[PDB]
Amino acid sequence: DRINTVRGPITISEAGFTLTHEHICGSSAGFLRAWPEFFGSRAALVEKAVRGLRRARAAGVRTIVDVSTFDIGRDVSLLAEVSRAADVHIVAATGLWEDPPLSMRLRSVEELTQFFLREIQYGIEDTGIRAGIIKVATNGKATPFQELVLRAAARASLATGVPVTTHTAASQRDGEQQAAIFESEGLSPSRVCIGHSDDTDDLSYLTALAARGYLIGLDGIPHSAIGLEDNASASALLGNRSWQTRALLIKALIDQGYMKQILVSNDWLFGFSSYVTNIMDVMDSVNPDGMAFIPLRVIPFLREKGVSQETLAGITVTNPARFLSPTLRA
Amino acid sequence: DRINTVRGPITISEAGFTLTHEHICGSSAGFLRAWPEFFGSRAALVEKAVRGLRRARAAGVRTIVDVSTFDIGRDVSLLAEVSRAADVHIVAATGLWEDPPLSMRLRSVEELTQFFLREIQYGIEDTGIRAGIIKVATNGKATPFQELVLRAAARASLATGVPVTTHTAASQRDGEQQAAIFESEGLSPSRVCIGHSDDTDDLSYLTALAARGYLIGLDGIPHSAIGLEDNASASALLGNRSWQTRALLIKALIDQGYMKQILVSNDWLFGFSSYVTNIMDVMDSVNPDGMAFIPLRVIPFLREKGVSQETLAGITVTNPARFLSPTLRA
Numbered sequence: 251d252r253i254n255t256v257r258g259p260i261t262i263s264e265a266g267f268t269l270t271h272e273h274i275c276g277s278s279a280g281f282l283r284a285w286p287e288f289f290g291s292r293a294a295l296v297e298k299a300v301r302g303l304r305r306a307r308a309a310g311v312r313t314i315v316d317v318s319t320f321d322i323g324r325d326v327s328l329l330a331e332v333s334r335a336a337d338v339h340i341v342a343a344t345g346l347w348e349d350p351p352l353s354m355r356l357r358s359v360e361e362l363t364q365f366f367l368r369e370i371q372y373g374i375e376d377t378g379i380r381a382g383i384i385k386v387a388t389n390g391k392a393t394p395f396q397e398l399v400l401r402a403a404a405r406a407s408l409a410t411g412v413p414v415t416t417h418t419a420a421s422q423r424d425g426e427q428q429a430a431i432f433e434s435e436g437l438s439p440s441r442v443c444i445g446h447s448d449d450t451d452d453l454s455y456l457t458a459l460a461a462r463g464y465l466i467g468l469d470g471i472p473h474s475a476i477g478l479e480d481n482a483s484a485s486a487l488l489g490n491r492s493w494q495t496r497a498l499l500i501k502a503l504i505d506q507g508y509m510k511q512i513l514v515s516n517d518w519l520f521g522f523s524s525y526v527t528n529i530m531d532v533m534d535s536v537n538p539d540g541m542a543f544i545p546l547r548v549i550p551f552l553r554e555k556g557v558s559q560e561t562l563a564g565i566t567v568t569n570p571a572r573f574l575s576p577t578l579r580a
Numbered sequence: 581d582r583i584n585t586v587r588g589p590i591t592i593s594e595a596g597f598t599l600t601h602e603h604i605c606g607s608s609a610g611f612l613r614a615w616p617e618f619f620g621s622r623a624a625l626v627e628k629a630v631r632g633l634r635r636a637r638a639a640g641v642r643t644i645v646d647v648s649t650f651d652i653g654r655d656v657s658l659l660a661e662v663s664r665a666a667d668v669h670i671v672a673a674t675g676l677w678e679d680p681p682l683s684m685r686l687r688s689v690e691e692l693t694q695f696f697l698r699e700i701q702y703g704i705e706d707t708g709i710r711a712g713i714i715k716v717a718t719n720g721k722a723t724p725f726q727e728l729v730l731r732a733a734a735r736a737s738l739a740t741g742v743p744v745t746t747h748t749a750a751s752q753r754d755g756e757q758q759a760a761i762f763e764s765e766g767l768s769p770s771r772v773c774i775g776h777s778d779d780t781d782d783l784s785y786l787t788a789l790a791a792r793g794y795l796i797g798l799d800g801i802p803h804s805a806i807g808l809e810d811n812a813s814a815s816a817l818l819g820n821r822s823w824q825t826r827a828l829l830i831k832a833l834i835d836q837g838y839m840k841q842i843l844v845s846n847d848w849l850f851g852f853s854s855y856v857t858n859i860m861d862v863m864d865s866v867n868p869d870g871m872a873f874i875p876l877r878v879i880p881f882l883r884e885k886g887v888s889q890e891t892l893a894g895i896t897v898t899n900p901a902r903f904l905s906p907t908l909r910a
């Protein structure tokens with residue numbers, strides 16, 4: 251019962267209020283090292299992230315789970331530096347997202363399992379920092395390689411107790427296939443969060459997952475392009491459903507009896523090179539609260555709509571602790 | 581008139597016998613750092629590369645051009661270590677090959693030009709090592725992003741005098757479109773090598789490029805799967821034309837008056853993670869000479885077929901020096 255962070259193991263009690271799907275920087279493997287000026291400078295990115303995490307900490311956040319994989323350009327040295335300076339725990343991820351390079355896409359399920367286990371059990375690169383979560387992705391029907399990634403993630407989870415969290419095209423109901431593959435490997439749904447699930451309003455899809463034991467990641471609450479006029483790229487990324495609409499899915503699942511299975515987050519970033527240039531500026535204009543958006547805006551909104559403080563504390567503290575603490579069956 | 585290597589500038593005289601298309605390791609950005617055990621260990625890869633380069637040096641090679649880009653997982657610290665230990669100059673590359681990540685594929689022609697110029701004029705990552713060549717790629721008709729890469733490579737070459745070298749699907753005559761795009765930006769064909777050109781027997785394609793001034797990269801001479809029975813992956817990568825057939829294209833271009841435009845190489849590697857597992861073992865069984873294959877087997881073969889020593893010295897020493905030495909018009 252300890253959770254690996256970029257600064258070492260922490261007890262479940264130390265995690266506190268936890269955002270379960272966030273990014274310091276959404277990039278690509280090697281990109282921050284090769285082209286730091288894309289972000290102004292590495293120091294500028296560090297400074298921005300520390301300011302943002304300090305603001306989140308002032309609003310009550312104690313831990314974020316950075317679900318950046320290898321192919322999101324996860325730099326655990328950057329995460330450790332930012333975590334130290336902001337006094338916010340950061341859980342790092344292994345796994346693979348939607349942009350694996352050839353050297354990953356040509357691998358077998360066994361090889362991929364070895365790589366994920368390396369990052370969980372030994373360390374990331376030469377840093378000794380161990381991942382506390384496994385991140386995977388589909389965008390519609392899984393590609394053949396994505397099927398291997400899902401299976402390898404299940405195998406790594408079954409060996410270590412570390413949970414799996416997923417990226418979906420929620421409107422395509424990807425979670426159903428993801429669940430099918432995970433269960434074919436014997437993985438407990440208690441160890442899996444189906445993420446980007448606030449991208450859909452289909453309650454039959456969401457409750458079908460929750461009914462069989464999955465955690466539901468409502469992780470992009472502030473993502474919306476409403477009020478951005480004539481920005482095609484921002485609308486394609488963020489959608490045109492309001493943050494209130496996304497947040498009300500939290501209340502819906504509470505009202506259906508799934509309060510213990512909800513995980514809430516911002517899916518925010520402090521740099522973002524894997525999309526159009528200046529998307530970060532657009533996103534910061536939409537949501538200047540950044541990662542503090544959940545505690546500063548969503549929690550009071552749900553309280554106004556009748557959700558209790560106790561229930562929201564369970565969702566933001568108890569559920570992330572139960573999810574992250576390593577086990578085969580949570 | 582100095583050429584950048586991973587150990588600093590060298591004079592044109594110091595380059596000597598030069599292989600113009602080689603790789604220490606064919607991988608993906610960040611992969612060697614994240615999963616060195618894929619290659620046994622980093623130290624094992626270093627040892628293998630040093631042994632191979634020492635064998636090449638004993639056969640007469642003095643310089644190789646490592647045309648690994650960012651997305652081939654070029655590790656210039658690895659190149660410098662291997663170059664020091666083997667006493668063989670290594671020229672590093674910028675540019676982009678066929679596996680760019682999202683953080684590259686979303687960039688503009690201007691942004692890409694900035695990145696290529698960074699690696700030529702300032703340094704690669706934080707190493708201060710500067711690229712001496714720009715590598716680009718198409719596989720058939722250029723994708724929209726590949727058109728931007730080709731244009732940015734031309735712009736970087738026009739600003740610095742550093743040459744461009746290309747990957748083609750030679751049987752699809754990619755060099756014709758590559759030339760068209762390069763020339764639309766004003767780039768001199770004297771600054772461009774159209775590579776993998778030994779993958780085709782079409783002399784009308786090859787002479788059409790050479791006639792307008794391009795250098796012709798006959799750079800995969802030992803690549804052949806003849807005599808490998810029932811290895812689909814090796815045959816798809818290496819082809820079923822013999823090394824003698826590839827080598828005779830050198831003689832053909834000499835006989836057509838293009839001796840000053842021929843560049844010859846092995847396109848060898850000491851590690852190879854961007855293809856099927858154990859491809860390196862298959863390749864080493866096909867060609868145990870590795871990068872020494874050109875001087876030990878191809879040069880004597882061409883001499884037996886009537887090519888003079890003087891002409892082969894011009895192709896292996898003079899042409900690479902004229903190609904690499906920075907200039908707008910060579």
Ligand SMILES: *[C@H]1CC[C@@](C)(CC)CC1
Nearest residue numbers: 504556557558560561562
């Ligand atoms: C938390 C306490 C339970 C209610 C009131 C009903 C599920 C929701 C808020």
Ligand SMILES: *[C@H]1CC[C@@](C)(CC)CC1
Nearest residue numbers: 834886887888890891892
């Ligand atoms: C090098 C000298 C010229 C010949 C004999 C004819 C082009 C080829 C070998």
Ligand SMILES: [Zn+2]
Nearest residue numbers: 416417418446
């Ligand atoms: Zn995602």
Ligand SMILES: [Zn+2]
Nearest residue numbers: 271273317517
């Ligand atoms: Zn995310």
Ligand SMILES: [Zn+2]
Nearest residue numbers: 746747748776
């Ligand atoms: Zn190539």
Ligand SMILES: [Zn+2]
Nearest residue numbers: 601603647847
């Ligand atoms: Zn090559």
